[model samples]
Target: MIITLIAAMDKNRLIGRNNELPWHLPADLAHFKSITLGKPIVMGRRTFDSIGKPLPHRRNIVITQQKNLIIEGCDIFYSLDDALSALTKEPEVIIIGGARIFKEALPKADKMILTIINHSFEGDVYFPEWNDKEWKITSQIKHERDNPYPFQFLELRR
Candidate 1:
């Protein structure tokens, strides 16, 4: 089983601004769905709140320390370890994000499906920094005209 991370970030590693994504890239959204479709996706509470509902057809999991927090369609865990331990049976589990969730999941991830934008955006939230030496790019595709900004879909593996 692989613990995969799926996220899109700008040149400056910007992911969000006001509790929402910094860019409006529909093509990348479709890419995200294709990779995570049937997999269990985990995220922090704010990440789930941004989408406003559970993504259909896959298990929605949230890592939060908030007490009495219950979302009708989501599985909540106080720690990432607990959620991950519970997910051991899955073939692949996608760690979706918010800074807090990404920070903790990076080291445990064996694969990363990332959309790296060529443009920078104004944002307060950014992706966690990780060493490239720890991963090898298994696949990569550059899409120069797919959207407003040029981007690359990089699939990296440890």
Candidate 2:
């Protein structure tokens, strides 16, 4: 199965502040929904909590260190390896994240679907630093600054 990492980050690599996305980009949200629908997505517990509920039509697998944390309609795993193991044999699996989860999944990721917001923000959470040399950019679509910042959707393959 293809393991993919999906994320949106600003030029400074800021992804979130206070457990929420630092920016409001409707197009990015729609793009995320379109790409992830009907796929299995693995995420950290904090990421799941920030979302609050199971995303429709996707298999939600949350990794948490806490024991006996029950969340209806979602699968829980103690570690990223366990979460990947429990996943069905889907052609592709997306790793949605909080910082730590993204860091852990980066080494195993076969592809990345990223939204690069062309602006900087002061955020507490960030996407992990990755080597640009390790992957080749397959495609990119640049968007106008309809929101506070211009953004581009990029697809990369290792």
Candidate 3:
């Protein structure tokens, strides 16, 4: 099985502010939906809460230490191992965000699908640094947005 990290980060590696994304990029959301359409997606509890609803057509696994916490349409797990146990034997699985979740899953991830935003922001959470010695860039698609932040979609392999 392959673990993949999927996320969008700013120039400063900022991902979120106040439990929400700082930007509204519909195109990015569309691309995200297409890529993760039928796979299992694992995210942190905060990320799950931020979404406000379960994403349809995918298996949702929210990692949290709280045993009794539940979200409508998602299976909750107190640990990563528990979440992985319920994962299907698929070739790939997507790890969605919330900084703490990204940090916990980074070592296990075989590849990374990174949306590189060319802007910086003041955020309380940030993604871990990319180590070129450990990961190789496999592919990239640069996208120019009318919203002023041109970003690249990068695929990195371990």
By lDDT, the best candidate is 2
Of the two candidates 2 and 3, the one with more favorable lDDT, higher being better, is 2
Alpha-carbon shift of residue 36 in model 2 (angstroms): 0.4
What's the TM-score of every candidate structure?
Answer: 0.97, 0.97, 0.94
User: Arrange candidates by lDDT, highest first: which order?
Assistant: 2, 1, 3
lDDT of 3 by residue, 1-158 (tens): 88999998888888999998988777678878998999999998889889988899998989988877868899888888777776757778899987888888898889999888988787798998867899998999998888577888899999
Q: What number of backbone clashes does candidate 2 have, counting pairs of residues 3 or more apart or in separate chains?
A: 0
Tell me the number of clashing residue pairs for each predicted model: 0, 0, 0
Off by over 4 Å in 1: none
Sliding window of 10 residues with minimal summed lDDT for model 2: 82-91
What's every prediction's RMSD, in angstroms? 0.9, 0.9, 1.2
Task: State the lDDT of candidate 1 residue by residue for 60-149, as single tens digits.
Answer: 999888989889899999999999999888888899998888888998999998899999788899999989899999999999874889
Local distance difference test, per candidate?
0.90, 0.92, 0.86
